[PDB]
Write a protein that binds this ligand. Structure first.
Ligand SMILES: CC[C@H](CO)Nc1nc(NCc2ccccc2)c2[nH]nc(C(C)C)c2n1
Length: 288
């Protein structure tokens, strides 16, 4: 079974298991092989969910090539891409990723999200580390719909405030928040909200966007982890938060970072925003 694959090198530690670059001995294709990590035997719902995921195919979603439920273990075989967006951002720190490339990437991810969301599938843990790029200018979402299949230092920087405040049931809005954080980060070359605990993450959000109340976010004061005793921070103008993001970009971003999940712009509506009026598909500068 696994004898069909030859390890080439360790790619990294995923959320649900280790990932290796590998070669299929029969077909010669190079792939990304993931071993899913209480060992009793793969749960039936994990198997049905992942099998659902195999059929959710899109150019901006990393292809799930094979689900290998063998010997009471679970291996996932994925399409391989040569680099992730975190590494590419770090690589691009001195000059920044050119705006046209930022716009193209945001546009493509919004397409991927719109597609997943239209199928009622959430990502839940969007972050630069699981965004993957190739030499032809494509960007792809990895680990989509995995959270649902399996219910799990982890980064908090991209986590929506409703999650932080204890909301039990995520909506598609949590992915829009995350992507918004990543958008700002590509533009400014600085993480928007680099929290190192849940309360630090929350307080960093509060300090920038203002401490949320019933006016901006109805029902907020009733959430499991909301405290009347939260400090009261005033909101700051975005011109100060994300230069040199232009007026169209700042307008779109504001809509992606709305506190109330129900007011937060959808992936499909975001695609129609004037920010994408001049969108094009440039090629990244990659040296591997
Ligand atoms: C470890 C999980 C994350 C996202 O799944 N990484 C990560 N990185 C990649 N390539 C970037 C890379 C290439 C060579 C060396 C190091 C990194 C990937 N290609 N295909 C996959 C699937 C498992 C989603 C993948 N995952």
């Amino acid at each position: 079974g696994m004898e069909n694959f030859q390890k080439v090198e360790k790619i990294g530690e995923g959320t649900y298991g280790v990932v290796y670059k590998a070669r299929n001995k029969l077909t010669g294709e190079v792939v990304a092989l993931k071993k899913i990590r209480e060992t009793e035997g793969v749960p039936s719902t994990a198997i049905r969910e992942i099998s659902l995921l195999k059929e959710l195919n899109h150019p901006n979603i990393v292809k799930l090539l094979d689900v290998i439920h063998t010997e009471n273990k679970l291996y996932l075989v994925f399409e391989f891409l040569h680099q992730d967006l975190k590494k590419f951002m770090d690589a691009s720190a001195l000059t920044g990723i050119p705006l046209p490339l930022i716009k193209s990437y945001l546009f493509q991810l919004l397409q991927g999200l719109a597609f997943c969301h239209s199928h009622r599938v959430l990502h839940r843990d969007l972050k630069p580390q699981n965004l993957l790029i190739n030499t032809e200018g494509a960007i792809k979402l990895a680990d989509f719909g995995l959270a649902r299949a399996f219910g799990v230092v982890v980064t908090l920087w991209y986590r929506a405030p409703e999650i932080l405040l204890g909301c039990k049931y995520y909506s598609t809005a949590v992915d829009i928040w995350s992507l918004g954080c990543i958008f700002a980060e590509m533009v400014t070359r600085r993480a928007l909200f680099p929290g190192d605990s849940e309360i630090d993450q929350l307080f960093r959000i509060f300090r920038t966007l203002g401490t949320p109340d019933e006016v901006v976010w109805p029902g907020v004061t009733s959430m499991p982890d909301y405290k009347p005793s939260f400090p009261k921070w005033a909101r700051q103008d975005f011109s100060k938060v994300v230069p040199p993001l232009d007026e169209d970009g700042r307008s779109l971003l504001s809509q992606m970072l709305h506190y109330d999940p129900n007011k937060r712009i959808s992936a499909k509506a975001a695609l129609a925003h004037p920010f994408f009026q001049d969108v094009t598909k440039p090629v990244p500068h990659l040296r591997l």
